[PDB]
Ligand binder design. Sequence first.
Ligand SMILES: CC(C)Oc1ccc(C(=O)Nc2cccc3c(-c4cnn(CC(F)(F)F)c4)ccnc23)cc1
Ligand SMILES: CC(C)Oc1ccc(C(=O)Nc2cccc3c(-c4cnn(CC(F)(F)F)c4)ccnc23)cc1
Lengths: 289, 289, 238, 238, 99, 38, 38, 49
Amino acid sequence: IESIIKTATDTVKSEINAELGVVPSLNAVETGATSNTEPEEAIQTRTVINQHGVSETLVENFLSRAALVSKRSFEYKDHTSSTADKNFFKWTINTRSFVQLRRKLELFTYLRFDAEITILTTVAVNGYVGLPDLTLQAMFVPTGALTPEKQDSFHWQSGSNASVFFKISDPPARITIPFMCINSAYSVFYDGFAGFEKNGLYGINPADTIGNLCVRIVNEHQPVGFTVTVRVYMKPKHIKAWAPRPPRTLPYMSIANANYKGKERAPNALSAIIGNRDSVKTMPHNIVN
Amino acid sequence: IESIIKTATDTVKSEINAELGVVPSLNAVETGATSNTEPEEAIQTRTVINQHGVSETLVENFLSRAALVSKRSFEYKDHTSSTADKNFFKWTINTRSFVQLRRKLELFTYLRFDAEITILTTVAVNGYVGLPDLTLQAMFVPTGALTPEKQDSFHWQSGSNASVFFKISDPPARITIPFMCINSAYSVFYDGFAGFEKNGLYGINPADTIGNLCVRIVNEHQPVGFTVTVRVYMKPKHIKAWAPRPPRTLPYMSIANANYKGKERAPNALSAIIGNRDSVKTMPHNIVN
Amino acid sequence: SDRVLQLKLGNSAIVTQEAANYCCAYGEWPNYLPDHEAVAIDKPTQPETATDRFYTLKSVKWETGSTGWWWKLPDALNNIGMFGQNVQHHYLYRSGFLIHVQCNATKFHQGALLVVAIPEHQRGAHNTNTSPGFDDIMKGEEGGTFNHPYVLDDGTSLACATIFPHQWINLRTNNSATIVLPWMNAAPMDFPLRHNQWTLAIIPVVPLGTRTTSSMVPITVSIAPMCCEFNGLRHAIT
Amino acid sequence: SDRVLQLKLGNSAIVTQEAANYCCAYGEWPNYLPDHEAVAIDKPTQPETATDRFYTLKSVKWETGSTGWWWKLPDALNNIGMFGQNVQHHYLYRSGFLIHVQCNATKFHQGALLVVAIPEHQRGAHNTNTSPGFDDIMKGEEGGTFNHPYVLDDGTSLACATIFPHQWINLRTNNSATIVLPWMNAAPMDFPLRHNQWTLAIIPVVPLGTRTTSSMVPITVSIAPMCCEFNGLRHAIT
Amino acid sequence: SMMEINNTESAVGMERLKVDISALTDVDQLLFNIPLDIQLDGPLRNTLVGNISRYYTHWSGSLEMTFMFCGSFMAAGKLILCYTPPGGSCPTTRETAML
Amino acid sequence: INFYKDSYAASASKQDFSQDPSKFTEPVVEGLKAAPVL
Amino acid sequence: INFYKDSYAASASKQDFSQDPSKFTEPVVEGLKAAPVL
Amino acid sequence: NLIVPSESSDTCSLIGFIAAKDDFSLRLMRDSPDIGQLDHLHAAEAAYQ
Ligand SMILES: CC(C)Oc1ccc(C(=O)Nc2cccc3c(-c4cnn(CC(F)(F)F)c4)ccnc23)cc1
Ligand SMILES: CC(C)Oc1ccc(C(=O)Nc2cccc3c(-c4cnn(CC(F)(F)F)c4)ccnc23)cc1
């Protein structure tokens, strides 16, 4: 039954028992219920008034911290001879590329949230003359819109796409993206195929497609080359979460799938997740005096 | 009849019909009215309580996003020998030069709006020593006022013209221009001639003339040359719109007229707007398993 | 009193004399889609007892080397009876399921099956970058076998799978498991041929053992769809 | 006002602009079987819009030599859509029918079709003692052609067939006929594969004629089962 | 607004906005089909619903198709117009489309 | 937040949910019924 | 502090202390007593 | 079938139309793929002269 829980539960004092037909420490795991044995039933307890708050394990607090989702470096230079990100890049938006945020998100089956996006830009001189204060444009290109082909293409005029223009000397640029799934929740996992034929992608729900982030330098190139690095952070907020999942153990292989190999030996090998001890009778860090 | 609509309409359940003299799926297109057949009349429906909002298709939201209307590059240098924008330029204000905003505006015959103007400036060193933090002046020169002839002419003293002075290291400069037509609405299209003689321009309403934007660098030239690029964005706001129009299909040719040529082949050729399929019986992306 | 259970749905009934309660996943029960959650506006067909009945799949042999078995829903039932015909003729489907898993042995046998219903059990392949193909996933009535049950074939772990709806069959204690699944999807309905809401998994965490004379020990799976709805009447994809 | 009619059932609709009222056979309307008339005690499936919809049969050419056409119900529909699947999976069936017959031609054409629904149209053979065989009777969707429409292929007469539920298509006047049939049987339900309640017959009492350039003049039959019930869920006979 | 259903080579300009029907000598023949992708370049793109919707990424709700017959007063006929929900191939026979 | 003296300075007015599509869908002098149009 | 017009712009909602762990710990149709489970 | 007399044209035309109903809704505004430019329009430069 649903109730409001702000602090951990109190302990009541308990006495000796000795009752026939009452066995609170016996349980039946086959039902699928977890053990309902209370500490007051297992041992003699004292009264403890418990004041420990539970706010830090709220799903909102557990998930709503900003994490890196995209990092891209490119050359800001005269690109007339290059083969390359020619003063701009396109990113197909995903949340699976950096494992810290990915693993936390994958503790859940369904998530509904708004995304706070922070864009951090940094610049170095190519192998010094000072660092230029560049203007950048980030343009959100949804599904079925045309992406820019060039730094100076007319796609950047952004008649209806959301663009943010920001300087390197500014604080990091920030926008919120609304929860934009065509369903009521994102499918964090998807046991299905994207298309009506058999050749569509496994494991990606088409309902969750965000689109493209296109980022250019707006300045014309300088006589000298720079490396620009863009970092994108996402913070989920206003979060609802459903059906918690067993956590990822094996290293991720791919952003496209759940494929697994494991480490060559324990921990997190396919044959042994926990590191080995000599025997079930060995206490590995036993106190000896 | 006018009513307030915030969400899409609900669907009622419907039963079998079989009524003589009642034929809701039959229509008469020759009247000019669109079909009034409801889904409840065409098929058996269930009840659906519809919660989908309609705010994103408000004319205010559809039009009030900032779009590029002017882009100009010029040399910031000693111009004593040049032929050129000699540290300043004049722009005859128009909204027809960039096709994304133009095509959206041309979905309507008459528009009344205030214009939010954002000015973005960027600088590169000519073919490096760092980038200078220049001061620029933008001056609105209405109809019949004198425009500057030189970077240092006394027109720039701006006794009664609106000027904004802004730095490159600032955020983009922003002002709102009021709705300033001599009529109650701008004429987006104008089936007429500008003058009382026959030689005036076709297709421009004199009532909609805004004036000139004159932009100079206020600094004296440096010993080295820079390219300055100015970008002007307009955002319509407080918008009223009348008489929706069929959209532009063929590429624009000119800012001065609606002249048309089309692409050499479909799509958007003069003979064929939609790309061809083999026959009226061919399903181009047919699902096959 | 919680060891004997009769399940009756349509023209089918199951009795068991050694249950261990039963699981209602997340405390939910199946229900039809209410009007305040509806999307598709055509009137649904609700076939009731024609579809809301137990279908019994082919039994699998529990053997000493067994890694476990899995079946995907609705895929395992998409070709069975009047449920399958409605699946083939309609674009959209919605239902719950009643799952009953059956395994009996002697009082001299030992062994424990984890019986777990996994929502959106998106599989991984082992030791490759290539995603699982259509024929790796879509097994139909036969179902599949676990490659690496210890990581649930998805880089995760068996040990933590008890976060999902489950019972155990412990041959010492019980010969059957029952799980009731609600509709479990982000959308209110789905196309039944390209997405599976639920995977049933049966994994022998304790292997089958005895020193009596050996017999074949089958595991049998019976599944009743519950509150089936279908929308978008069409020809059969079939 | 009685010349324009729209019929809507499930996901299907028919409009006509030249009807001539419509017939409700014996003044009845289709209804479900009430409890005071029920025999079989299992809960019926009532698929509603999945079955209670128009099915359009193959069109037949009206030609100068045509003797007329017939289709038996439920037999003509027993293999079509979700109606056919329920027929194949259930021992027992009950429904009404909505019959719409379609034939248009120019204002320079002439011709009259008697469109008649015959209950228990037990056929005779011509000039033999041997009763009609299974393949003479069971035609399915294609239907049959009349051997001797003047005696209705049963030693009787066409002239008196207007005692049965009927309309006419008179090309001068109307391009469609509609007949609504109730359940018409001595038993409250029947096995759909061995007995036909109704035969639709279309007989050209006045032949097709014109002196304009000839075109193919098809006759099209659309039939909606109404209030379909099925009992005795089984595997498919199929 | 008018669909460009006859988006075929050898239909030029206004010829692309009409479909021509003739008397047939075989029963129940297919006359034409209409692709329903608004995103891809089909008959629906250059329409009022089409052009406005392509400023957006998501859409929901019902569409109406109306057909006006522009033969002579003396022309007669019956057509069947069928919508097939997705999941299989486009139907090529009337007995399939009728479902 | 608007501390400017001219009301045209303000932010956009996204609150007008009034519609009348019948001026474009049904500009017929006699309204359609649910019913032969002609 | 939220002067934006869209409510999705707001700061995070850290106030929902409602829990129901029994949907995960006790999804049994008949609840456990304090008492032989089986 | 289409059935016509000798003095009517043997071939007849359909015009097809589409509209949204009032249950229709649109979301997530984007730049339309139906328009673009690779060059300055004619007389665009002359706005600066
Ligand atoms: C240019 C400016 C104006 O607009 C911008 C728009 C967007 C961004 C940007 O980078 N956004 C994002 C980056 C990474 C992930 C997301 C997701 C997301 C992915 N997956 N999920 C479900 C989950 F978690 F369950 F997997 C949710 C949703 C929306 N945005 C995302 C940056 C800028
Ligand atoms: C220097 C500072 C102090 O003052 C400034 C004043 C103005 C600007 C500037 O660039 N303004 C503008 C640029 C582009 C178009 C317009 C329009 C307009 C054109 N056409 N229409 C009707 C339509 F849409 F229907 F066609 C409306 C109206 C007012 N301004 C405009 C920049 C700065």
